[PDB]
Every structure is written in C-alpha cells, then in structure tokens.
Design a protein around this ligand. Structure first.
Ligand SMILES: C[C@@H]1C[C@H](C)CN(C(=O)c2cc(Br)ccc2NC(=O)CCC(=O)O)C1
Ligand code: NI
Length: 558
C-alpha cells in the first residue's frame, strides 16, 4: 500500500487551551448577532480529519505527463538561485513562530543569538553529512474560524525551528524565483488582486468562445506522492545552485519532504507521513508545481483548446476555447479522469462556465463596479461569510494573524470591505487610540507587520485611486453581500453608511495620517465628496516582495 498516513493511535493533542465558541464582548453585537453561526475548529475533531486525509494513492504516468515535466525542467535550467546565510534566513522568521525543542525561540533566531545560530549551523552540517535519517515533525490541529454550513480541524505538520531556517538557507531563493520562470503568467502568486483580474479578463478576452472552470482536488496534500515530491527535487536541481545547496535540497527531500515520523505536542508518536507536509517551505511551491504539471498534462489528454491555466498552490482555474457546450462537458470528464490517474481526483466535480464572474478561484471571483467617471471597472471580490466570521472573532479576541487587516489589503475595492470592515475596525481603533500600532497579517501565506494608518498609501499602490471611488456594484454582488449579513445577523448596509459618516468625521478630527484615512477610506460615505489626489507617501512605499511568491505553511516574515 501507498498510504498517505499510518497511525499508531496516539491522539493529536493541543498545546494550549482551545476555544470553539465565539468569544463575545461589548463590541460583538455591533457587528454580528447570530453568535452561534460562528465557531473555531479544535483538536477534538482531528480524528475526523485523519479519516479524510488517510487513503491509498495510485499513479499512472503517461507521455503527456513526461512531456510537460521535460518542458518544466528546461525552463527550470534557466534559474540561478542563491544560498542564504544563517543571518539572512533568521530575519525571515516570524517573531511568534514556534520555538525550538533545543532551548531557543523565534525571538532568539531573529536577534541572531549565538545559541540559535550555533544550533542552526549544526542542523546544516547534519543535512550535508546525512541524507537518509527521517527528520522529526510535529502534527497539530489548526484553530480556524468559519461560519456553519462544522468542518473538522485542518492538520499542520512542521519540523523543528532549526530545520525551518535551514530550509530557507537552502531554498528560499528557489521557491521565490523558480515557479514564475517555469510557469510564466500561469503562476498566480506573482499578481496583486488587480493584476489577477487583468490576467483573468485579458485571457477570457483572448478566446473567440471562452470557457473556464475551476478544479477542486480532494485533499491535495494527501494526494501528493513520493514520486511527485522526487519530481519536484529534480526540478529544483535543474537550477544553477551552489554545491552545498544541492546537497541540502537532496537531504531535505529524502529526510523531510518525502515523509517522516509524526509527533504530538505531548511527545508521543502519532504515526508516519508519506505525503506533503503542510508546514514546510516548499509546500506552496511544491503544490503549485505538482498541480501545474498534472493539470497541464490533463489538458493535453482532454484535447482542450488554447488552454491558459492559473495556478495558486492546489488552486486551479483553466480558461480555454469552447468546442461547443457538449464537447466541453465531455472534455472535462476526460481532464478529470486524467487528473485522477495522476493522483488528483476532484472533491467537487468541475463545471464548465461561460460567464467569467461566475468562476471561483482562490475563493474569489471577478466583478464589476464603476469609477468616478462612470467607466466599468473589474476588481476582485469574494463571499464575505468567512471574512465576517473571523472579524467577529477578532472583535473580542487578540489573535496572531489579523485577518481583517489582510482582507482590507486584498479586497479594498469591495462593497463589503469598505462598508463593514473599514468602518468596524477603524471605529474600534479610534476608541482605543491604537491607530498607529502595527498589526500582523498574512498575504499569500507570508507575515507582514502593517500600520493601519498606512492603509491609504497601501491601497492606492495596490489597487489605484479608483478603489476609493467605486460605486454601482452589480446586483448579484450586492445581493450576495446583503444576504450574507442576514445569515450572520450583521446590521444591513444602511447602518454601516450611517456609522462610516461618524467614523470618517472622527478620523479627520485627529489630523495627520488619521485624517488621510478619514478623507480617502470613507469618501464613499458622504454626499459632498473631497478631492482625492495621489499620496506622496504612496510613491515612496517600499512594497517589494509583496506579490512575488506563495509561502503558505512556509514560516515566512517580511
Ligand atoms: C449597495 C449599497 C447599499 C447601501 C445602503 C448604500 N451604498 C453605499 O453607501 C455605497 C458604499 C460604497 Br463602499 C460605495 C458606493 C456606495 N453607493 C452607491 O453605489 C450608490 C449608487 C451609485 O452611486 O451608483 C451602496
Ligand atoms: Ni509526446
């Protein structure tokens, strides 16, 4: 058997006390009344996830697969990648990333303390000298917030801190550089949300009769086989690399990436992994390469015409030429059969779509609004259910990752981000005078320390000034927002408009950066608008590294 996991029977254990029910404070009801709709996942449901992720994988590899791989390797050979120093690798480590089993923490790593740096050096030497001994990993249940309809906790699998820094030294430059070179415009993590909409729309516009579909692989990490993971290393090895980097990548593949022993928080042996570790540097890059490889081959197998893929890890969308409605449904059944043969069967079956705004990829869809001139403007949005469940949790609880800040960055142009999220959280931050306190959030899986007072500069830079003037959202978009609010017990959009006028007035009264936030962020709320001009600070905003690559699970801080 080629099983994704084997289990001893030891439980997946928490390392802290876990909350499942929505924490409520005095601010909760101003956002959300249906508190019972909102939950966090815990280790109590881990067993249910273990049944989902444990299965036998079969893989039949044909000539389309090897043809695509050979083309990918040829592009990969043009990549020259650098070895990071220990010091460079250390500054990429999140301030609150899990501490070592070996007497030092993430703060120690970032300060380049001699004890951390000495141990990292010893893990590095061990990797160069030993290419066989499985590396230990911890298995944990993630605590994640959702609206009902309950999901079981996702699992996270990660090596010790010293190993994680070693992954960066060996491979940070590779996973940041290689996928765009190999996949070109198909690599999703190179785009901002607006660069993504322009690619999707331009691609849709370059087909006589466009057809698109998203493809949902059931448990993508568990579908990743030893072959798949060895193929990724052969792709990494195509790069021009230093001899120490080649040996470290070989060693990390053999000892960590291919599989290893699973240990709970209590130190007990839980089992063994033979699939993708969800918490290593190469998770995002490995997943994107494996998904693009299999999908590219599956496109050729199905005889899909003029195929453009967009791939973000395990998230896949294809836009192609329609050969007619019946040949489309048929070609999708063959694409799906090919994918299955390659060990990537679907969860939901793929559906062909003939309207761009109806395809969901990366939990997002294109939509249309109008700028300050009446022009039709395409922008990225999503169903706000999960953004709003998480915002409710963050209303009453301090969390490591402020999802609301990251959702405002990613979805600033949206009706729901501007009306609810900006209104709610600027109002909370005004009341606490915490406007200039930097908060952690994540974009494409990497962690960023961000001042909420810098939001005007940031939004202009990523989305343009039009994000501050959009209006006349589509009916379907308005109805999905309004309907989500009713479900969660959120006050309707008229209440938020009334609240934003208050919040705006309050911000301008602070002067300076707060006034800029009031001026730019809430101009949609007043009838007598202000003159919104390019912000000098935005020009100078150092936004390098932001949408280059994906590092979900990769333990990255910028
Ligand atoms: C769909 C919302 C319903 C709410 C009651 C009012 N309303 C807004 O205040 C609004 C919010 C943002 Br953010 C941007 C524009 C808004 N107003 C409009 O789109 C009004 C119609 C228009 O200008 O075409 C729109
Ligand atoms: Ni061939």
């Amino acid at each position: 058997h080629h099983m994704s996991y084997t289990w001893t029977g030891a439980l997946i254990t928490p390392c802290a006390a876990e909350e499942s029910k929505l924490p409520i404070n005095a601010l909760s009801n101003s956002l959300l009344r249906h508190h019972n709709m909102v939950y966090a996942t815990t280790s109590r449901s881990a067993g249910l996830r273990q049944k989902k992720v444990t299965f036998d994988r079969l893989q039949v590899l044909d000539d389309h697969y090897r043809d695509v791989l050979k083309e990918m390797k040829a592009k990969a050979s043009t990549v020259k990648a650098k070895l990071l120093s220990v010091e460079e690798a250390c500054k990429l480590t999140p301030p609150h990333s899990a501490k070592s089993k070996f007497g030092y923490g993430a703060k120690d790593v970032r300060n380049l303390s001699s004890k951390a740096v000495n141990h990292i050096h010893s893990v590095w030497k061990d990797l160069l000298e030993d290419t066989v001994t499985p590396i230990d990993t911890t298995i944990m249940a993630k605590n994640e917030v959702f609206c009902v309809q309950r999901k079981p906790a996702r699992l996270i699998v990660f090596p010790d801190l010293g190993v994680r820094v070693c992954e960066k030294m060996a491979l940070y430059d590779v996973v940041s550089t290689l996928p765009q070179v190999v996949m070109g415009s198909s690599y999703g993590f190179q785009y901002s949300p607006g660069q993504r909409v322009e690619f999707l729309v331009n691609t849709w516009k370059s087909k006589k009769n466009p057809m698109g579909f998203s493809y949902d692989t059931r448990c993508f990490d568990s579908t990743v086989t030893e072959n798949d993971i060895r193929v990724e290393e052969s792709i990494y090895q195509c790069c021009d690399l230093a001899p120490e980097a080649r040996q470290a990548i070989k060693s990390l593949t053999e000892r960590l990436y291919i599989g290893g022993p699973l240990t709970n928080s209590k130190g007990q042996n839980c089992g063994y992994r033979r699939c993708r570790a969800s918490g290593v540097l190469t998770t995002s890059c490995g997943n994107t390469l494996t998904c693009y490889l299999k999908a590219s081959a599956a496109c050729r197998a199905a005889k899909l015409q003029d195929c453009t893929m967009l791939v973000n890890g395990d998230d896949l969308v294809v836009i192609c030429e329609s050969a007619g409605t019946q040949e489309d449904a048929a070609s999708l059944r063959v694409f799906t059969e090919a994918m299955t043969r390659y060990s990537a069967p679907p969860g939901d079956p793929p559906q062909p779509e003939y309207d761009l705004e109806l395809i969901t990829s990366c939990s997002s869809n294109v939509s249309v609004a109008h700028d300050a001139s009446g022009k039709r403007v395409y922008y990225l949005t999503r169903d706000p259910t999960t953004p709003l469940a998480r915002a409710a949790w963050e209303t009453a609880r301090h969390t490591p990752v402020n999802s609301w800040l990251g959702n405002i960055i990613m979805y600033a142009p949206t009706l729901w981000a501007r009306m609810i999220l900006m209104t709610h959280f600027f109002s909370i931050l005004l009341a606490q005078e915490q406007l200039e306190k930097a908060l952690d959030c994540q974009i494409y899986g990497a962690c960023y320390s961000i001042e909420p007072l810098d939001l005007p500069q940031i939004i202009e830079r990523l989305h343009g000034l039009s994000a501050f003037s959009l209006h006349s959202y589509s009916p379907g978009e308005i109805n999905r927002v309004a309907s989500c609010l009713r479900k969660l017990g959120v006050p309707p959009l008229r209440v938020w408009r009334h609240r934003a006028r208050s919040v705006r007035a309050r911000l301008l009264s602070q002067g300076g950066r707060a006034a800029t936030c009031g001026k730019y962020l809430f101009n949609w709320a007043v009838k007598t608008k202000l003159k919104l001009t390019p912000i000098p600070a935005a020009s100078r905003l150092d936004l390098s590294g932001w949408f280059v690559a994906g590092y979900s699970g990769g333990d990255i801080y910028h």
